[PDB]
Amino acid sequence: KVFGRCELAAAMKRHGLDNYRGYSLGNWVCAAKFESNFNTQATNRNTDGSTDYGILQINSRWWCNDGRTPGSRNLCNIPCSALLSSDITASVNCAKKIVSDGNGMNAWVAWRNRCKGTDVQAWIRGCRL
């Protein structure tokens, strides 16, 4: 599923991401935009042989099981395919875990490089939230 911007903002806000670990909703929308282009089905291979999955490009190195990342963990206790669903519940639950485990949203390289230090609440401007 490719979300609209406000459509994703509203879903993220319902699952409790607005201000989660102090990151305003616009941060999460911005991250999704640049990580996945709002596409739940996005996948991208990494140099170490892991893959990033879903709307927030969650890594098989640590967070989910994809069956081809030998030696990896599955800290969200899910198949990586669960992160590609039209229902973002699993991605959101796993992202909460990720953002809590030390480096905050710097875990998302596109957020660091394209959202951090920008006017991120522009990403929710116009939305009826």
UniProtKB/Swiss-Prot annotation:
Q: Which residues form the C-type lysozyme domain?
A: 1-129
Tissue-wise expression: In the egg white and polymorphonuclear leukocytes.
The set of disulfide-linked cysteines is 6-127, 30-115, 64-80, 76-94
Hydrolase listed as a keyword = yes
List its EC numbers. 3.2.1.17
Q: What class of enzyme is it?
A: hydrolase
Task: Name any one Pfam family assigned in the record.
Answer: Lys
- Top-rank lineage group of the source organism: Eukaryota
Please name the GO terms that the record assigns under molecular function: beta-N-acetylglucosaminidase activity; identical protein binding; lysozyme activity
Principal subcellular localization: secreted
Query: Which residues are annotated as active site?
Result: 35, 52
**Coiled-coil residues:** none
Q: Which reaction does it catalyse?
A: Hydrolysis of (1->4)-beta-linkages between N-acetylmuramic acid and N-acetyl-D-glucosamine residues in a peptidoglycan and between N-acetyl-D-glucosamine residues in chitodextrins
Q: Where does substrate bind?
A: 101
Q: Which UniProt keywords apply?
A: Allergen, Antimicrobial, Bacteriolytic enzyme, Disulfide bond, Glycosidase, Hydrolase, Secreted, Signal
- Is Manganese a UniProt keyword of this protein? no
Task: Cite the PANTHER family for this sequence.
Answer: LYSOZYME C
Subunit annotation? Monomer.
* Role description: Lysozymes have primarily a bacteriolytic function; those in tissues and body fluids are associated with the monocyte-macrophage system and enhance the activity of immunoagents. Has bacteriolytic activity against M.luteus.
Task: Tell me its family.
Answer: Belongs to the glycosyl hydrolase 22 family.
Extra remark beyond the main annotation? Lysozyme C is capable of both hydrolysis and transglycosylation; it also shows a slight esterase activity. It acts rapidly on both peptide-substituted and unsubstituted peptidoglycan, and slowly on chitin oligosaccharides.
Q: What is this protein called?
A: Lysozyme C
Q: Record the organism.
A: Gallus gallus (Chicken)
The uppermost taxa in this organism's lineage are: Eukaryota, Metazoa, Chordata, Craniata, Vertebrata
